[PDB]
Amino acid sequence: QSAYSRIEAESYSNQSGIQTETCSEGGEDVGFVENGDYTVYNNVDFGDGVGGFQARVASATSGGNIEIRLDSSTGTLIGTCPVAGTGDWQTYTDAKCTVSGVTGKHDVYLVFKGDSGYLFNLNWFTFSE
Ligand SMILES: O[C@@H]1[C@@H](O)[C@H](O)OC[C@H]1O
Ligand code: NA
């Protein structure tokens, strides 16, 4: 799958600790996110050109960070996307960050880190050139 496509969060290959649920904007979100949870998207093709990451997120708390790691849940970090409260678990906004240069095909781990409690819900994400 292309890094530059819209990747629905619920389309993960593997996950730890989360649950999918009905998303107010349509489709599903990955919710029940606590510090240390993650989702994995296999065989993402970055080509040569990546510069950024955009995630569609909601949070009734104070959010947290999405660590973007390659090939394992503790693997090389290529960006950390800050996520901020939106006042409701089903009112979404765009969280965005820069991403270090990378090439080729990798399994992408989105590793959710933050304070105590639930962090945010993730509807979909994408990378930008
Ligand atoms: O959306 C989820 C909500 O349904 C649950 O009650 O709290 C955790 C959130 O992620
Ligand atoms: Na979704």
Contacts of 26 (CB under 8 A, 6+ apart): none
Helix H or strand E segment including 14: strand 14-16
Task: Name the CATH superfamily housing domain 1-129.
Answer: Galactose-binding domain-like (2.60.120.260)
Pocket perturbation via mutation, ligand 1, pick of 30, 121, 123 by most ligand atoms within 8 A of CB: 121
Q: Nearest ligand to the C-alpha of residue 23?
A: 2
Nearest CA to ligand 1 atom 6: 32
CB atoms within 10 A of CB 32: 14
The whole-angstrom separation of Cα 53 and Cα 24 is 22
Pocket perturbation via mutation, ligand 1, pick of 28, 32, 90 by most ligand atoms within 8 A of CB: 32
Contacts of 14 (CB under 8 A, 6+ apart): 39, 40, 42
Cβ(121)–Cβ(23) under 8 Å? yes
**What is the structure's resolution, reported in angstroms to one decimal?**
1.5
Q: Nearest ligand to the C-alpha of residue 26?
A: 2
Domain boundaries, the chain: 1-129
Q: What are phi and psi of 108, to 5 degrees?
A: -105, 125
The structure tokens listed for 93 are: 């906004």
Atom of ligand 1 nearest to the CA of 90: 1
The whole-angstrom separation of Cα 117 and Cα 124 is 22
- Ligand 1 surroundings by CB, under 6 angstroms: 21, 31-32, 89, 118, 121
CB atoms within 10 A of CB 93: 17
Cβ(68)–Cβ(99) under 8 Å? yes
